Design a protein around this ligand. Structure first.
Ligand code: SAH
Ligand code: CA
Length: 212
């Protein structure tokens, strides 16, 4: 019984089906009071909400779905006929996200593509995609910079395409910021957001020397 399964149960048991806001408050409630989980949260969500409303996207790409919180967060604001694509490399997470979208009533607005961003991004042409209006980067931080260039070289970015990258300060995406902040092709803006708690997997490598 994974933690992602438990979050889904709590939603299925507490949220008003077909009410995305109710879904979000159920996830925020459970992930603030029972088990912390790596969803953007409501505070960041309110930034995301304003970016979507102020930039009025029609085609959105998400890198990193996890349980679907940020997909529900964005999908619920999109206009009729607007699409959200979300790329997720973990199949267990993708399934959880799919149920989350179904319960929220947003499955018609979203298309989950299972796989790694670096392998799927070059495929988007074969998904009836020309260019993107908005891109939310919240997957592996090691991938913000190469995916951005990949999106450029693939001809997926248009003049005015919005990029929104999470966790640029904590734990940090300093090469990505240095690239877009320093490039003439990107006009950047930073949105501070307080964070009460965040846990990320790290590790230590022991290496015993055995001789030349
Ligand atoms: N290269 C890659 N391609 C697609 N997904 C990736 C990826 N590297 C990491 N991920 C996924 O990105 C997720 C980051 S957590 C994302 C949280 C979610 N976007 C939200 O805020 O609601 C993880 O579930 C991980 O499986
Ligand atoms: Ca995040």
């Amino acid at each position: 019984d994974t933690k992602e399964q438990r979050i889904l149960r709590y939603v299925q048991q507490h949220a008003k089906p077909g009410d995305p806001q109710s879904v979000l408050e159920a996830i925020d409630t459970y992930c603030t009071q029972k088990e912390w989980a790596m969803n953007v949260g409501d505070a960041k969500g309110q930034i995301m909400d304003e970016v979507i409303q102020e930039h009025n996207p029609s085609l959105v790409l998400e890198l990193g779905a996890y349980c679907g919180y940020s997909a529900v967060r964005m999908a619920r604001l999109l206009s009729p006929g607007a699409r959200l694509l979300t790329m997720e490399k973990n199949p267990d997470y993708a399934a959880i996200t799919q149920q989350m979208l179904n319960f929220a009533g947003l499955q018609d607005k979203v298309t989950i593509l299972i796989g790694a961003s670096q392998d799927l991004i070059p495929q988007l042409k074969k998904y009836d995609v020309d260019t993107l209006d908005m891109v939310f980067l919240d997957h592996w931080k090691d991938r913000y910079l190469p995916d951005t260039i990949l999106l450029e070289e693939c001809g997926l970015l248009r003049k005015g395409t919005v990029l929104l990258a999470d966790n640029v300060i904590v734990p940090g995406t300093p090469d990505f910021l240095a690239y877009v902040r320093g490039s003439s092709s990107f006009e950047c803006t930073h949105y501070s957001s307080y964070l009460e708690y965040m846990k990320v997997v790290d590790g230590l490598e022991k290496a015993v020397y055995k001789g030349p």
